[PDB]
Design a protein around this ligand. Structure first.
Ligand SMILES: C[C@]1(O)CCN(c2nc(N3C[C@@H](O)[C@@H](O)C3)cc(C(F)(F)F)c2C#N)C1
Ligand SMILES: C[C@]1(O)CCN(c2nc(N3C[C@@H](O)[C@@H](O)C3)cc(C(F)(F)F)c2C#N)C1
Lengths: 296, 301
């Protein structure tokens, strides 16, 4: 019961830092270039390790030079990679990321390689006893629902002391994913998902979507410079203002920084109000830096 | 390994990692989109010419700057896949190996480019000074850091002054970017390639106007070459006779990216084989024309 497991993607982010977003059909020179290990669940692992939490990553990878870079990076951060679902078919996903240096906007052109996703069968092979918290990045929802039902079954057969806490992230406005609201102790819904469902604020989104979550669950919604909100079974809307840096230079992975910091803070026994504030704190620090070094 | 004396064609210039993403529509800033297809390609003018020289059957070498890392590893493996000798690469302790991001909009064909940064130092005259030239029969320089490259060209002239005519290294220069720094390179080389883009920027409206207008800038006995896309290519040498070749357009134009580099490498190859300027012009148009109907460099020969 010592690790935080993050289930989701690992993508190679080929970053270009620009002073202005390029206008279509133009040729701009970038300020700098870097490779960064990406993917939501993968980014959350980086943050958890920097926060001082033992963590594990579970996701699909295909042997090759890109996976070698990603594995070395994960290992350099002390992220346990023993749960990786190695694939014989597909290439490693990669994306071209344009980071605007004047406002931190990040634009991602993802190349999804048909790498088969982590299956309920792959998850069934995992001994859950070493995990205190399991975070699932919403992707192949029907297959992830089965993984979540397995954690519930495990929890039924354990005393309250040994129960594995569960969190779910619904970040893409894909209908398949909306069934994941009914699973997990903590549900993270993105601003992009909330806006697609017709909500114009975090408070509105929480009130509107709370009926979709499991009994006793906490629904969390971060809203960029507007900070973040959370709503629990007691019906009290919780809010935290953002901690924006004086100069916002990179928001790539700011959402993942928030998620990991909220999870970390809750796994440490802190209240929802303290976890919300801490998430905004670390996410805000991240936005004033390139990458993840120096967030703590 | 052992490279026989006077056997290679050396190409000095840029190697870049081109990341090309094909999209339905141009992404709006701060959005996360999925591309239709994505490819990692080795680019750069001198780099592209090396590929073509290898496919033509010429032993060839590339000289350019690279920084140790995963990008350089991809580029080196891609050079090797194309039989290019990479032993002359100027490995750098500072800077990033060039990488570019191209976004191609599938609904209108628009190409948006986020060019490589300027962090990596270019090949210097002192890096070039360390090269034993005896293994090269031809040295092609892609015009970049002109003041440094002029010194490299002066070193080849000095080498040649002490050589019998049969052991003289032939030299070619490409002025492809409309940068004033580069215009001093016209006065160097046996063969000078000037691009249509450079010629137009200098106010020339045809390969003929460009050659007649710029010939006064080349050294005694040099051949000035100018390809003009579908209008074919022209050359002008010391005899004052303007030479022309019509283009050999493919039945359907597929990919013109690196067609200029294909022309340059084919002209060089043909001249290094002892063919005349007229024959080299025609051969350059033929290979460049074949390339335009092909994706990449496979099947150009
Ligand atoms: C958990 C998060 O919601 C993920 C995104 N995020 C932030 N996004 C910001 N922007 C994204 C894009 O809309 C830009 O125009 C500005 C700006 C900031 C801030 F300014 F506060 F630093 C934060 C913070 N933290 C926190
Ligand atoms: C050595 C070269 O001059 C460099 C470019 N080139 C061509 N460019 C063409 N363009 C089409 C358009 O996309 C523009 O880039 C110009 C069309 C053709 C042709 F139609 F003839 F095949 C050729 C040929 N050969 C040969």
């Amino acid at each position: 019961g010592s690790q935080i497991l993050c289930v989701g993607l690992v993508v190679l982010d080929v970053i270009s830092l620009v002073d202005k977003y390029p206008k279509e059909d133009s040729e701009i020179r970038c300020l700098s270039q870097r490779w960064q290990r990406g993917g939501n669940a993968s980014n959350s692992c980086t943050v958890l390790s920097l926060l001082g939490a033992p963590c594990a990553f579970m996701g699909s990878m295909a042997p090759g030079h890109v996976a070698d870079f990603l594995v070395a990076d994960f290992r350099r951060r002390g992220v346990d990679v023993s749960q990786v679902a190695w694939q014989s078919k597909g290439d490693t996903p990669s994306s071209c990321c344009i980071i605007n240096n004047s406002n931190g906007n990040r634009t991602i052109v993802l190349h999804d390689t048909s790498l088969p996703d982590v299956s309920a069968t792959d998850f069934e092979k995992v001994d859950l006893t070493q995990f205190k918290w399991i975070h699932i990045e919403g992707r192949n929802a029907s297959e992830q629902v089965k993984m979540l039902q397995r954690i519930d079954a495990h929890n039924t057969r354990q005393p309250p002391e040994q129960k594995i806490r569960v969190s779910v992230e619904v970040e893409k406005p894909r209908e398949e994913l909306f069934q994941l609201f009914g699973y997990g102790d903590v549900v993270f819904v993105s601003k992009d998902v909330a806006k697609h469902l017709g909500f114009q604020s975090a408070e509105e989104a929480l009130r509107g979507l709370y009926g979709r979550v499991r009994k006793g669950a906490v629904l969390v919604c971060a809203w960029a410079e507007e900070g973040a909100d959370a709503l629990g079974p007691d019906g009290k809307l919780l809010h935290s203002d953002a901690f924006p840096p004086p100069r916002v230079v990179d928001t790539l992975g700011a959402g993942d920084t928030f998620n990991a910091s909220v999870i970390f803070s809750l796994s440490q026994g802190r209240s929802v109000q303290e976890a919300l504030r801490f998430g905004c704190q670390v996410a805000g620090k991240k936005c004033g830096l390139q990458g993840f070094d120096g967030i703590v």
